[PDB]
Amino acid sequence: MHGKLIGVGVGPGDSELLTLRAVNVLRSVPVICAPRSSSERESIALSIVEDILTERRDGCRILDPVFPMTDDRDELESHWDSAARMVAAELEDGRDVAFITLGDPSIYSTFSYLQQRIEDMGFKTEMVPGVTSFTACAATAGRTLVEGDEILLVVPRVDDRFERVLRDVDACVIMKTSRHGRRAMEVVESDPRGKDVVSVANCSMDDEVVERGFASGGGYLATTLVRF
């Protein structure tokens, strides 16, 4: 009888990159959870599912717990606490909640922060996978990531681990690349092997930018793909 928490991957931007399953959950759940920063009117995940939500003859309740960009670790933790409290109030009343996530819910989505709390409160949890941004970026660039015996590495940051590991991998995905392109260029280009590098911003959206090398547009939604 409890509501369940469902982590729903929404894909990289284009509504046509939602899965049939995602579309089905989102057309049916009574509650959607789409967290946002303080100066956002709506998260990017909510704007992706806008048309679906407004197509609905039935009403959907939107939970949009606020996450200030300025939170220190303790305030962030406390803001996840109250997010879980508003979500659990829905599940306590028998209503399923779909937590929408850009791309796929298993890849840097923040889903686990809510998920751990909700399962600790004794509720049940599910996940719907999606097109992750990095395979969508490979697709738009007309490029394959890995084949045969090649190793893929996915990083959110340029760090010392990244540097010492790089020679033992054949391809790598660099997330948040508007913050990370410069450091990334330096590390990858010091590698003696031939490399093919491309960066993609706003993949699958109207303002998508494909650029050779370690930069594209400077917005939050940029990813770099490296193949050796």
Ligand X SMILES: Nc1ncnc2c1ncn2[C@@H]1O[C@H](CSCC[C@H](N)C(=O)O)[C@@H](O)[C@H]1O
Q: Which residue has the tokens 């998508």?
A: 208
- Find which of a copy of itself, ligand X, none residue 222 binds, CB within 5 to 8 Å per kind: ligand X
- Is 195 flagged in the annotation as binding? no
Q: How far apart are CA 60 and CA 120, in angstroms?
A: 26
User: What's the CA gap between 77 and 113, in Å, rounded?
Assistant: 9
- Annotation-wise, does 113 bind a ligand? no
Task: Choose, by CB under 8 A, the member of 64, 110, 178, 211 that binds a copy of itself.
Answer: 110
Among 143, 183, 210, 211, binds a copy of itself (CB under 8 A): 143
Contact present, 141 and 135 (Cβ < 8 Å): no
161: buried, middle or exposed (CB in 10 Å: 19+, 13-18, 0-12)? exposed
Are 10 and 103 in contact, with CB atoms under 8 Å apart? yes
172 appears as a binding residue in the annotation? no
Binds 154, which of ligand X, a copy of itself, none (CB < 5 to 8 A, cut-off by type)? a copy of itself
**Least distance between a copy of itself and beta carbon 156 (Å):** 5
Binding-site member from 3, 13, 35, 105 for a copy of itself (CB under 8 A): 105
Q: Closest by alpha carbon to 130, among 101, 173, 151? A: 101
Query: Residues, the chain, total?
Result: 228
The only residue of 32, 128, 221, 222 in contact with a copy of itself, by rule CB under 8 A: 128
Q: Segment near a copy of itself (CB under 8 A), from 36-44, 85-93, 120-128, 192-200?
A: 120-128
Tally Cβ neighbours within 10 Å of residue 138. Answer: 22
Q: For residue 110, say whether it is annotated as part of any ligand binding site.
A: no
The option from ligand X, a copy of itself, none interacting with 16 (CB < 5 to 8 A, set by class) reads a copy of itself
| 41: CB partners within 8 A, 6+ apart | none
Two tokens at 219? 């917005």
Of residues 35-94, which lie at the interface with a copy of itself (CB under 8 A)? Answer: none
Which residue type sits at 151?
I
- Rounded to whole angstroms, how far apart are CA atoms 141 and 203? 10
| Amino acid letter for position 159 | D
Is 12 labelled as part of a ligand binding site? yes
Out of 142, 192, 194, 206, the only residue in the binding site for a copy of itself (CB under 8 A) is 142
221 binds, among ligand X, a copy of itself, none (CB under 5 to 8 A by kind): ligand X
132 contributes a contact to ligand X by CB under 6 A: yes
Query: Which residue in the set 31, 114, 221, 226 belongs to the binding site for ligand X (CB under 6 A)?
Result: 221
The separation between the first and the last C-alpha atoms of the chain, rounded to the nearest angstrom, is 52
- Which residues of the chain form contacts with a copy of itself (CB under 8 A)? 7, 9, 11-12, 14-21, 23-24, 104-113, 115, 125-132, 135-136, 138-140, 142-157, 159, 161-162, 164-165, 168-169
Residues making up the binding site for S-adenosyl-L-homocysteine: 12, 104, 132-133, 176, 203, 220, 222-223
